[PDB]
Amino acid sequence: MDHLPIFCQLRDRDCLIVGGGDVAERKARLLLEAGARLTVNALTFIPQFTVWANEGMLTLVEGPFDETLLDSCWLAIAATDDDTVNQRVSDAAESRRIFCNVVDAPKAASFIMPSIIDRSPLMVAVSAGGTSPVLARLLREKLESLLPQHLGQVARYAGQLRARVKKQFATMGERRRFWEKFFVNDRLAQSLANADEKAVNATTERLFSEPLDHRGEVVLVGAGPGDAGLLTLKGLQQIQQADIVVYDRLVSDDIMNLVRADADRVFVGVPQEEINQILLREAQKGKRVVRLKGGDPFIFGRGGEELETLCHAGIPFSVVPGITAASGCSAYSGIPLTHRDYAQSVRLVTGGGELDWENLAAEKQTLVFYMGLNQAATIQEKLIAFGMQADMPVALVENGTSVKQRVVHGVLTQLGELAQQVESPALIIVGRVVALRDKLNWFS
Amino acid sequence: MDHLPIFCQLRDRDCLIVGGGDVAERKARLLLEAGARLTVNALTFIPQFTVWANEGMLTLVEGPFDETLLDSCWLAIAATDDDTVNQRVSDAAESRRIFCNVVDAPKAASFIMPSIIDRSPLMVAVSAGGTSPVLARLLREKLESLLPQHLGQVARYAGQLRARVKKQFATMGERRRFWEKFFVNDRLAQSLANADEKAVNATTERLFSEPLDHRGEVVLVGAGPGDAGLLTLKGLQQIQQADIVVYDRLVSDDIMNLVRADADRVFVGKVPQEEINQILLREAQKGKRVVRLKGGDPFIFGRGGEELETLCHAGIPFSVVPGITAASGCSAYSGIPLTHRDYAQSVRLVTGHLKGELDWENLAAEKQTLVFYMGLNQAATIQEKLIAFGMQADMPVALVENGTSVKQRVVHGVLTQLGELAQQVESPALIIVGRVVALRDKLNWFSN
Ligand SMILES: Nc1ncnc2c1ncn2[C@@H]1O[C@H](CSCC[C@H](N)C(=O)O)[C@@H](O)[C@H]1O
Ligand SMILES: Nc1ncnc2c1ncn2[C@@H]1O[C@H](CSCC[C@H](N)C(=O)O)[C@@H](O)[C@H]1O
Ligand SMILES: [Cl-]
Ligand SMILES: [Cl-]
Ligand SMILES: [Cl-]
């Protein structure tokens, strides 16, 4: 072992930073967030320090490095661009047995600052001794994506319940299993975060009442339009905690690979009624069910209908929104849905009853047709017949955001022509913003 | 932050443990692996301390607590079962400004020892501060089943190459690009774990030979509507690796905590558009990875087109990471789906304040959900115009303030109440008009 990680209590402990530039500013933010009684000594200071000083958050000492400033200090940081000053600081700290970091020379003095994932009171720290800061940030990134934002509130509450769980769960197998469902209970975490103290007390007693077997709940998760990177952090966390994942064709294979093989998978790509009962049945057997749907669950996803089935049965649910096809395709095709005065509104529209064509034909809109390929010849002839100018730009985006994305574009009088040239899943975008693609297309 | 994690170099530094039982032994073992010069002061010692002392790996002092034994120490650990003694140790260490752990009292004294996942020289440390040692242990096992055991050898080889990387690559960006390739090369990791130095050298030689692009980049990243969990995985990657992050006030606080700690951050809240464009242009022309972090989605009422056309006109590369737009986030978190069955044919995302003006006949049409962005100040005009162009007076409306955050507020009513409803909230807020608003009483799962 090269270094021993320790977690220091710095509240109201004198710490010293030498330096007043951006390096020192980054270190000082860290120590302020830890509650240090912070002094900063530098020949000059950047404006952020005077701001902190005027708010009484720290003390500034302008001038050359003064070793007597280390007199009552617990930690020192050398954060200048001058190697002779940093060596003076680390030498004075060493002789006082004060742990010291030289920012630009991690093996020069006595401690290294790791990458930190803060879920206080829960904290994770990653370092490799300065041999590989890029690896440390790469690992920090994975951990940040995995650890729910409000886990620390759950950790705090867990400690207050340590006594109750022991008196109810005899063996450590049992309370280990209790703690495992406790730390993944979404209703509890959001109830703690929202300061809804009655939902806390309801969730708390429901967690003690039900069998350890039962963790029944459904999460509707929007998987985004295809690219696995367009899943949300919460969405990834939910599919990592699922007992059962119910998905269909419009969920990309790259998304499905982020589900651990330890979860049951149920493929329902079958009228809507059957899907509703599947979710019902598996939530009532007490499993964590994630219903994965393409894009956003509440935008032509029939997501509402599945949740109404669950409401009439008393099964907790939540929804994780996702990137709808329009947003994904817009960003990845270089076609902004709005721009300057081009469009006062964006219309997301499907392809008994039928569409209001005069309304769709009006100016200053971006039109986005979902499930519109089969009707694309109709859409061309009717938009023209209802006054939309023949030179209106149109684009069709197929498999948007994925490695198979194809974009075709022209004007409206060639819209029906370009539509047989693509296949589902495809969006039809009509409007002046379509012209912007020649400049903004950064993708395939 | 409850604690500040630091990684201490203990080689040849005096450390004191008080106590000689099984707790002290566990801590002594750790401090010996770290290379500490270790004294153990205790009334009695379990046999393992005899084994260590015979080998000359530490100094035993048999007797009650000797405060003067702290005088040259960098760390102290109180590991007795006597809380009077433990607190004398903590007090003596405090006066000397020596960080001190009381093992049976995490909240007392001045450092805590975390759980350690060892892939030396790579190390991960986890602690919940004694609030939930069960959580720390569950997390410690997940981290174990996540970090490959190859990883220590990749990190060790990186350490050996750092001098050559600094010599051969002039700029900081080049060195970063090298390391970013180095750490994801699976063949190199396999060859290191196999001690196949022929393969190690050939892959390494090729890595050093690749042209490294020096161009700065600008990434437009949608931060989503507030909740940090609604950032995309790709958006998180970009802000974890940017040099500079240019962020609005419509980017929540929790999102900014996800920026890498050593990134520079430039505020552009309330500055006009051509201020922002130029700030991006220049830091990008400095060869730095720039992330432009905007609320919601960058291409929905975000003015992301204008910033990018300036960079295209100047030869600067760029990309766009979409985000959850306010309509989708507030929809999910208020229990108001934007489409549903027969209710809504179409969703309209509309801006509220503009220059000619809005096409109210168009907006008043039945079977749609209207979502007004930036429309608070015109709520009275919206109600009057939609009524005048034939929308039913009892049409449900909702206003979502600070959607998806812990401060989210929802008010709802009918169209004839829209103007007064808007006075009960402030920016940032959405106006939702449509029959789907009535679904809230069955689909609301978040709060109120
Ligand atoms: N990756 C993709 N590229 C282009 N269009 C897509 C797409 N994924 C879904 N779509 C569109 O969405 C339609 C299915 S309806 C479901 C839409 C989803 N809830 C969402 O928010 O996007 C398809 O007919 C297609 O037009
Ligand atoms: N968290 C939130 N809750 C409610 N409305 C929000 C919001 N965040 C942004 N908005 C809306 O967005 C308007 C700014 S326009 C910026 C919109 C952003 N690009 C997006 O895609 O959502 C605000 O006036 C408000 O109407
Ligand atoms: Cl160094
Ligand atoms: Cl490192
Ligand atoms: Cl022993």
Author numbering:
A (entry chain B): 1 to 269, 277 to 358, 363 to 455
B (entry chain A): 1 to 270, 277 to 361, 364 to 456
Publication excerpt:
Siroheme is the modified isobacteriochlorin tetrapyrrole used by siroheme-dependent sulfite and nitrite reductases (SiR/NiRs) in catalyzing the six-electron reduction of sulfite to sulfide or nitrite to ammonia. CysG is encoded by a gene fusion between a C-terminal SUMT (CysGA) and an N-terminal bifunctional dehydrogenase/ferrochelatase (CysGB). The N-terminal enzyme module, CysGB, is a three-domain bifunctional dehydrogenase/ATP-independent class III ferrochelatase12 that performs the final two steps of siroheme biosynthesis. The C-terminal enzyme module, CysGA, is homologous to a well-studied class of SAM-dependent uro’gen III methyltransferases (SUMTs) that catalyzes the methylations to generate precorrin-210,13.
R260, which binds ring C C12 acetyl, and R261, which does not directly interact with carboxylate but contributes to the positively charged pocket that captures ring B, are part of the CysGA SUMT module. To test whether or not their contributions are essential for tetrapyrrole binding, we individually altered each to an alanine and tested the variants’ activities for dehydrogenase or chelatase activity. Both the R260A and R261A variants complement a cysG deficiency in E. coli grown on minimal media where SO42− is the sole sulfur source. The R261A variant has ~40-fold lower dehydrogenase activity and 20-fold lower chelatase activity. We next determined the X-ray crystal structures of the variants to test whether these alterations changed the relationship between the enzyme modules or their overall structure. Both R260A and R261A structures are similar to CysG and have a low root-mean-square deviation (RMSD) when aligned against Met8p14. R261 does not make a formal interaction with the tetrapyrrole, although it does contribute to the charged pocket that binds the carboxylates from ring B, so it is not surprising that removing the large, charged side chain does not substantially affect the structure. Interestingly, the culture expressing R260A, but not R261A, showed signs of precorrin-2 buildup in its pink fluorescence. R261A responded similarly to CysG to Co2+-challenged complementation, whereas R260A colonies were smaller and more strongly affected by increasing Co2+ concentration. R261A, D262A, and D262N retain some activity for both chemistries.
